[PDB]
Design a protein around this ligand. Structure first.
Ligand SMILES: Cc1ccc(Cl)cc1-c1[nH]c(-c2ccnc(N)n2)cc1C(N)=O
Length: 291
């Protein structure tokens, strides 16, 4: 009677979609048992410790609270008897992650298409910031492709809510951290804000324009600039020194000046000088209009 309530016994596994904490599978919700049910994407924990369950239930409320064309749609939850393990049910977006999709098609996706995706990602992020959420993991691997004309922000597993009276959230004991997408103040002080998401957005724009070429990925390029001999915590030390001296990812081969300019503006050491996602969406739509 309530379609946000999914009974797990009727979720049929179809295939694994990704692993990151969590796993996403494609399932058919098939309560008539005749293979006609809806196909959905299902997120669950690999280690459902009490601490993880708690964070996961907050992630689910975050997603449930977001309604936007460029944010994946929440469908419901599955609850288990007893220990109360949880599965998050979302729409299945059939072209998969933007990182996989662009790696697969490469330059057959032209600049016009790349800037349409850019604009949509900007708009999803602008909307997220109106709720005072900080994504913390904006990367093409977390953006999903609905069809050739539409992408959506597709995972919120590191997303935090800003304190009422602060414009940043400080992470006291960091877990796995995608340091190659992090703003300098996130690396030095574990401070995350709208402005650190904007820094990561400039890294997303870099990914798009390199077409996910492996040798050109943010980890490969930063490791090259700090030296491939650096390891473990020394990578973070040398990355902090590099970014303080204005070491930056290079201009991608073939990248339009106006786009490259946006990236480098997102990567300002001065937090206040980074652009807003409101203004990025305006600028990117003007660029698109110009083309
Ligand atoms: C984006 C993402 C983040 C974390 C995890 Cl655990 C899985 C995914 C993921 N999700 C999907 C996916 C694919 C299709 N629809 C939906 N809603 N999700 C693919 C992948 C992937 N990694 O390639």
């Amino acid at each position: 009677r309530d379609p946000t309530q999914f009974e797990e016994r009727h979720l049929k596994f179809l295939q694994q979609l990704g692993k990151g904490f969590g796993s996403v599978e494609m399932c058919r919700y098939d309560p008539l048992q005749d293979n006609t049910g809806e196909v959905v994407a299902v997120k669950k924990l690999q280690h459902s410790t009490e601490e993880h369950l708690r964070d996961f239930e907050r992630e689910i409320e975050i997603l449930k609270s977001l309604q936007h064309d460029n944010i994946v749609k929440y469908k419901g939850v599955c609850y288990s008897a007893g220990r109360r393990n949880l599965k998050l049910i979302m729409e299945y977006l059939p072209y998969g992650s933007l990182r996989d999709y662009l790696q697969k098609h490469k330059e057959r996706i032209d600049h016009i298409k790349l800037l349409q995706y850019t604009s949509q990602i900007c708009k999803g992020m602008e909307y997220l910031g109106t709720k005072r959420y900080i994504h913390r993991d904006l990367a093409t691997r977390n953006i999903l492709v609905e069809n050739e004309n539409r992408v959506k922000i597709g995972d919120f597993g590191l997303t935090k809510v800003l304190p009422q009276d602060k414009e940043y959230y400080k992470v006291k004991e960091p877990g796995e951290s995608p340091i190659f997408w992090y703003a300098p103040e996130s690396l030095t002080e574990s401070k995350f804000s709208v402005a650190s998401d904007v820094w990561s957005f400039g890294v997303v724009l870099y990914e798009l324009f390199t077409y996910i070429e492996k040798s050109k990925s943010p980890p490969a390029e930063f490791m090259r600039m700090i030296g491939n001999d650096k390891q473990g915590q020394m990578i973070v030390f040398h990355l902090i020194e590099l970014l303080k001296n204005n070491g930056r990812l290079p201009r991608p081969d073939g990248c339009p000046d106006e786009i490259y300019m946006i990236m480098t503006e997102c990567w300002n050491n001065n937090v206040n000088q980074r652009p807003s996602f409101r203004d990025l969406a305006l600028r990117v739509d003007q660029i698109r209009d110009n083309m």
